[PDB]
Amino acid sequence: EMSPQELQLHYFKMHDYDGNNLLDGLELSTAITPLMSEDELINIIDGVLRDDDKNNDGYIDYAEFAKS
């Protein structure tokens, strides 16, 4: 099995479908998804960007994802 660090990178790249080592809101959508209302989907993704995305570029990189 994986170390805690190897597990973090693993779940970071799990929805990095374009392989650019950055998580965008659409890639998050796919992670988050009968179906929830589109308003609750926006609220969640928005919350994640507001919490994780420090340089406000609409992406979450590994550093932002991990914290430490």
Partner: protein, 234 residues
């Protein structure tokens, strides 16, 4: 150097483009628009087809950039009718303008593959501003109305064609990646409109249609970015 912020709420892409229930999240499709998981076939190679995909809410960005990736494919050396990329005040869900409403308030960038006025100047890309009052002149391929234009054969290309449309400091710029290489950053200048006014708030959109002739109109992705001037904050 302008700050670039990705906006997921006004975007869509592969490889999970559609949701389990057939919707593109945050986008409305209409007419005969078909979303699947890797592309949206906006207008199929069937007769007199009309399709559009527009955003569900208005973007309020003073500066923006959209990158649209697409294929226009047809069995012949002449196809029809073409594809339109929009920023407008209202959703133009259905209508006669490359698949959507006429008399739009804003800008439509038309990728015109059909030479309706026989001027031998197609496929072409034309930028057409509108204020809610002008009818699109499709019999002259908008030549009486065009703010700027270029000649690009955007049909049947080895790789997806890309359009980069930038609205920055009042200037609307179109760059085209003509689909000859797998390098997605090989853009060439198409057209420029200085001092352009478009509404403060609008829907982004994409639409297609076919005539007697009929090309397949596939959009692989629509990527929207907010632009901030050096000195401000997003």
């Amino acid at each position: 150097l302008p700050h670039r912020r990705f906006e997921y709420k006004y975007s869509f892409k592969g490889p999970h483009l559609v949701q389990s229930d057939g919707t593109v999240p945050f986008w409305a499709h209409a007419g005969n628009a078909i979303p699947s998981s890797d592309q949206i076939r906006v207008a199929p190679s069937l007769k007199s087809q009309r399709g559009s995909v527009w955003t569900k809410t208005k973007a309020a960005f003073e500066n923006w950039e959209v990158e649209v990736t697409f294929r226009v494919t047809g069995r012949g050396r002449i196809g029809a009718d073409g594809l339109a990329i929009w920023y407008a005040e209202n959703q133009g869900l259905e209508g006669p303008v490359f698949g959507s409403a006429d008399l739009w308030n804003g800008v439509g960038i038309f990728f015109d593959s059909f030479d309706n006025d026989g001027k031998k100047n197609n496929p072409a890309i034309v930028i057409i501003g509108n204020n809610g009052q002008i009818h699109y002149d499709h019999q002259n391929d908008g030549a009486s109305q065009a703010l700027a234009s270029c000649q690009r054969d955007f049909r049947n290309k080895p790789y997806p064609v890309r359009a980069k449309i930038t609205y920055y400091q009042n200037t609307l710029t179109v760059m085209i990646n003509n689909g000859f290489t797998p390098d997605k950053n090989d853009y060439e200048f198409c057209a420029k409109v200085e001092n352009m006014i478009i509404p403060a708030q609008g829907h982004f959109g994409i639409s297609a249609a076919t005539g007697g002739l009929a090309d397949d109109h596939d959009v692989l992705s629509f990527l929207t970015f907010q632009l901030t001037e050096p000195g401000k904050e997003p």
